[PDB]
């Protein structure tokens, strides 16, 4: 819900033509201190039946069910967050859970088992900093797919884009105003978008930042006020 600022940030960088410079200095835009705490490490699109399951990099798991409710299991193996359609959020546990979440918890379990045995953890080899604690963990607000990508919007404002063909990824964060690019070799770097405007960047990243703008634009216009039917 910091989508508007992100759009403003992406528009800025794209309008500066970061790849159309005398000398491109992408390396000077790196800022390793801006690495995100959270991103999506795994996902399963079972949207024909039940919903979209995903794992965050801290090993927590979530499901955005088809009825637009969300269930989150923390990495403590016991803590649950349930987020209703309206955004209300309940916090609870697996040991003392309402009988009413039995179906949904069982489904989360099924998603969890599928993803431990067959999916890879994106960004598995990165060492987290002490805390990584906070804040209540993000949940999946919305997601969509294109021919080229899956688009994942988290409740802390981050927008993640996974490109299908080459396995490259963007993690965009609007508060830090930064973007993390995971390349074909799975290497990660974080850039300040404002320094990319300043020093430019390679065509590989620039094209992807242009695609990110159009995708972020699609998110804002989804069920927006101009057209609640989209």
């Amino acid at each position: 819900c910091h989508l508007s600022d992100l759009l403003q940030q992406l528009t800025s960088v794209n309008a500066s033509k970061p790849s159309e410079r005398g000398l491109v200095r992408q390396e000077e835009a790196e800022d390793p201190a801006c690495i995100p705490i959270f991103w999506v490490s795994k996902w399963v699109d079972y949207s024909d039946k039940y919903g979209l399951g995903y794992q965050l990099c801290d090993n927590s798991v979530g499901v955005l069910f088809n009825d637009s409710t969300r269930l989150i299991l923390y990495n403590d193996g016991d803590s649950l967050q349930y987020i209703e359609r309206d955004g209300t959020e309940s916090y609870l546990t697996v040991s003392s859970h309402p009988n009413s979440l039995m179906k949904k918890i069982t489904l989360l379990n099924y998603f969890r088992n599928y993803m431990s045995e067959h999916l890879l953890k994106a960004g598995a080899n990165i060492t987290p900093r002490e805390g990584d604690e906070l804040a209540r963990l993000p949940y999946l607000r919305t997601w969509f797919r294109t021919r080229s990508a899956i688009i994942l919007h988290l409740s802390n404002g981050t927008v993640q884009i996974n490109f299908f063909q080459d396995h490259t990824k963007l993690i965009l964060c609007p508060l830090m105003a930064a973007v993390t690019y995971i390349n074909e070799k799975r290497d990660f770097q974080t850039y300040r978008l404002s320094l990319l405007e300043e020093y430019g960047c390679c065509k590989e990243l620039a094209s992807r930042l242009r695609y990110a703008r159009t995708m972020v634009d699609k998110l804002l216009s989804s069920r927006s006020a101009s057209n609640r039917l989209k």
Binding site: N59, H118, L120, A122, F164
Partner: peptide
């Protein structure tokens, strides 16, 4: 395309 990248971290 319907699941993410396959093969074999960390619960």
């Amino acid at each position: 395309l319907v699941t993410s990248t396959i093969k074999t971290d960390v619960v």
